[PDB]
Amino acid sequence: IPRLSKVNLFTLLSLWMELFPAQVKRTGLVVVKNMKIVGLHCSSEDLHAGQIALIKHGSRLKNCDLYFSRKPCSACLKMIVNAGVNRISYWPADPEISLLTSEDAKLDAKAVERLKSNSRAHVCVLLQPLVCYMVQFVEETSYKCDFIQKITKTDFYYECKQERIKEYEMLFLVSNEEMHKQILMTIGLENLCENPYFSNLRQNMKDLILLLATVASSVPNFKHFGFYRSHNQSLPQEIARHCMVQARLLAYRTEDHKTGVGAVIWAEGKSRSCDGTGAMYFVGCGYNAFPVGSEYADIRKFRYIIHAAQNALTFRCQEIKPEERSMIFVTKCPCDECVPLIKGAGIKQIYAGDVDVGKKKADISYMRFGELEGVSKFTWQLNPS
Amino acid sequence: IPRLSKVNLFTLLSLWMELFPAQVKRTGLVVVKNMKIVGLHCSSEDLHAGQIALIKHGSRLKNCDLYFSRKPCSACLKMIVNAGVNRISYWPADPEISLLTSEDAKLDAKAVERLKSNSRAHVCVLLQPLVCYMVQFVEETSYKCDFIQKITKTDFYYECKQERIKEYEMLFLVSNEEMHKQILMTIGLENLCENPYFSNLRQNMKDLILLLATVASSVPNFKHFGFYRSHNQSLPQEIARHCMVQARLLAYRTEDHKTGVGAVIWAEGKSRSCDGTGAMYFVGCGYNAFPVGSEYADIRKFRYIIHAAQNALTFRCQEIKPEERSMIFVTKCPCDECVPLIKGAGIKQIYAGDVDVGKKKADISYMRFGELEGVSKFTWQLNPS
Amino acid sequence: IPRLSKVNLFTLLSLWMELFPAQVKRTGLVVVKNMKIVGLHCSSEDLHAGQIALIKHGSRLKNCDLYFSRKPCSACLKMIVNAGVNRISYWPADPEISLLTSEDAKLDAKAVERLKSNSRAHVCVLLQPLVCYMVQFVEETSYKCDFIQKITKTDFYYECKQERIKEYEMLFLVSNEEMHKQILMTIGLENLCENPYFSNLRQNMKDLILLLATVASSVPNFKHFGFYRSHNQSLPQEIARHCMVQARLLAYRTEDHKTGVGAVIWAEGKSRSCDGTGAMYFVGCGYNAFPVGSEYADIRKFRYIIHAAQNALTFRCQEIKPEERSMIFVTKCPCDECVPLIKGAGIKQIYAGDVDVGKKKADISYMRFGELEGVSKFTWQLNPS
Ligand SMILES: [Zn+2]
Ligand SMILES: [Zn+2]
Ligand SMILES: [Zn+2]
Ligand SMILES: [Zn+2]
Ligand SMILES: [Zn+2]
Ligand SMILES: [Zn+2]
């Protein structure tokens, strides 16, 4: 199956992070250490994503890859190059200080360019063209996902996808080519305004937004559908849908199996936070893959697949606090091998699609999820109220 | 004096961890990083030791040495090689999925062997023969230890040692040579099924169990003897004895001084835990040794000895939580130089053998232990009740 | 402007840490890792600074630079070379075990020298001479600092400076040359007892104490002046003055800008601690500088300055606990881009000199500090009571 590019996932997550429910525009930020996600941040009303990551990580930002949905300002860029980040990837549409409003906006962008010149860190654009079948593969698997088939069992998806397309190009894309060229002049991307580089960048950006709208619509705000019980209190539906699209994006990094499963872990601290996500903070993410260092990565072969929940718990940037409410979002029903790990790790809530619940396959089982105690299970369904 | 090897200590601690008081058999696990113990785990009713270590450490298992009392199954092995462990050492008697019950047990064992082929991590048997005088040295020093002499001052030890030999041979050894050969073939140890390698492995296994039964009997469940006050509530006697044997095993890594002292630090979390040890979790361990990076390691020379308690507090894998109940188990009375460190570190309880309490020797003193306030002191003695 | 060197700052901070308000003399200790301060410790009634740092850091002392205000004893030195420190710097005066009282004191010093010979770590005197204009620059800028100018608005400073010179010379310097030679004879500094090395060491020692007495007097205990509101409860005035002199010393590491700003972050844990500072523990420190790894460090150029508060929050050795009271001490009023960072980081209290509060300069503003909510602001002023 086609696999989402590893830097394209980080670019897509930063765009999705900007859409996290809550002159200067909101920015999503993905912090990546050792090519593993260690931070998912969004701008707040008071602080920018780059300044939030400095508070959250500080000197731990050393040798980290930062993926911005908007080019960071001079104040943000100086603080992260001071922290020691190596790569700063940004989505080249409109920076933090909007250029579509200003003399100050151009001045700040000009100061960013000369800060980049006099610095070791690399401020660049790391979005890649997708595989020829990648968009169609995501579009087909978004029909077949748990959350869309659940609604079907009880045409709508295509309508929902089209509205997300119009909304997301309105936010992440500059429709007017002349405005985009002026932005690329201002943010030091002069090499990308000459064809075919201008058209290639614009088509690559539109392809990534089309894929993002496809994935976001696969967990849609359709009717009263949401995550309900089937602490014990559920997350807000807008937040729960957002974290499931995160896990769904992670599910497209799977290439070792025919079906991609994605998992993301989020926790809610019992205190005020500076992040735009609020008390919500990222814990860990993972997808279905083979063990790192194994020959499979380079009886059925599925037995050695590391599941999405296992990878999320393995490469976690934060510890699970017993006092805090922690959530794991799995694109499928957690299996008989993953449920004990989730309960053992202390995760309070499970948000998953229970299409395969109670099923016993040849090499995987989903029997322990139905009879799970001590962990709140929220599944995609109509509101019981 | 004869010194226990590091791998032999780690192998013995994994066997001892399986005996931690609480088709698939229980497994003890020792996690070692940079030749320092960072985790002492045992299998629980719900999770295996390998799965527990993934929850406890996760990506921190990278380049960690894992010592299993039983060969881990395919689910455990794939997760730890995915985590990044380099060397997996197991006791070659009976794996997690018991082969003495099965087609599934053999099938899982065969799947483990081709993970070892298709992976970077090393699944080996780091078991070594003991020194010629090591067993006799341990047996002699077990007479002279504080806990045996405390009972003597108030023939029994040899009887206690003999029962542990029968019990531990029945648990960690395959007495029948034919079943042991079948296990070794099934777990990919065909090179150890031919003499003299078969006899050498079995004799070395029996030597390690005989030493383990000697050490375990030195802190015996004899009469009403235990650790009593002489938070503030004591540990369960079975747990306290187990942690003292851990420290006693660490005491045999000492070679810089004629007398070996061992210390281990354990704490109780105020929440549910997935480990087979329950809320108990390992904090740090150490023994009497010279400073690392000194000519002594490679004015009396004892004043340069780093004591067991100091080494335990130095190379601690966990921080001491003020809200938690933390315990240190010292094979002897803590000295006037270690008691301030234990109190300063915030350790709530001290379990020790106070044979030398109130004594002023040349390079060591034991006056501050008797007059210590703010720390609970539990010593080996008869129950005052 | 003249700039204080790193080793001289660490040496001066260790001497200042000895003066932290609360046979064997009190010792201040600075723990430095990767040229960043990760620990500010002082001796307590029960424990020494070297033993406290072992409790505070343990194995994290590996490859750490330890700066002592007095030469550590044999017990302290063995534990820190065992922990793995790569360099021990001490103030070449009366050591931890005072030699001005003793056969035991001389015996311990001989044991320290023998341990140093048979060990990898370097026990040295990293004291350096100051720049020719360094003392006069500090003396001039101490007139112009916020705290001295605040009192002037509401001759006194020179009198206060002279008493600190007499007090600090009596504490950190050996006035008699004969006793100082005997100390240097005993502590293995035989090469510093011959002129001009003896006179160079003594003159450099007196120069550092004169600079320290100049910085300390710039935040003096003059009349009722202190830090008052203008949790919510203020620190003790002696503690607050001490931490601001720490930040003021950090302000003299600034050379990128004509005016030096320093910031230090301290937190108070809600539990007993072994340190001589009590529940107070060091969090982070910083000064005004250009980003690390930038051409500026090796559109106005001040826009790229990393402020003292931003550097303190970036290179912090501890996290800001929401339940704890955390304090930041800034030598000047925090600017409009540092106040959001301080509030975002969760720092409860700000101690600063609000000379520039409410001022709007070309490239810096101080408008958000006056209208700050949720953070306690304590400024240098007379007691309102
Ligand atoms: Zn910004
Ligand atoms: Zn699974
Ligand atoms: Zn297993
Ligand atoms: Zn001791
Ligand atoms: Zn000392
Ligand atoms: Zn500032």
Residue numbers in the entry:
A (entry chain C), B (entry chain B), C (entry chain A): 30 to 51, 84 to 162, 167 to 219, 226 to 301, 310 to 377, 390 to 476
What do the authors say?
Vertebrates possess a second DCTD-like protein, CDADC1 (NYD-SP15).
We collected datasets of the CDADC1 E400A variant alone, in the presence of dCTP (“good” substrate), and in the presence of 5mdCTP (“bad” substrate). All three datasets were analyzed imposing either C3 (trimer) or D3 (dimer of trimers, hexamer) symmetry. The majority of the contacts are formed between Nα2 and Nα3 from the NTD of one protomer and Cα2 and Cα3 of the CTD of the other. This results in the vast interface of ~1,100 Å2 between the two adjacent protomers, according to the PISA server. In our structures, the side chain of E400 is missing, because the residue was mutated to alanine to prevent catalysis. The trimer maps in the ligand binding region and the trimer conformation suggested a ligand-free state of the trimer, irrespective of whether or not dCTP or 5mdCTP was present in the sample. There is no evidence for ligand binding in the maps of the CTD active sites, and no significant structural changes seem to occur, suggesting that trimers do not bind dCTP or 5mdCTP.
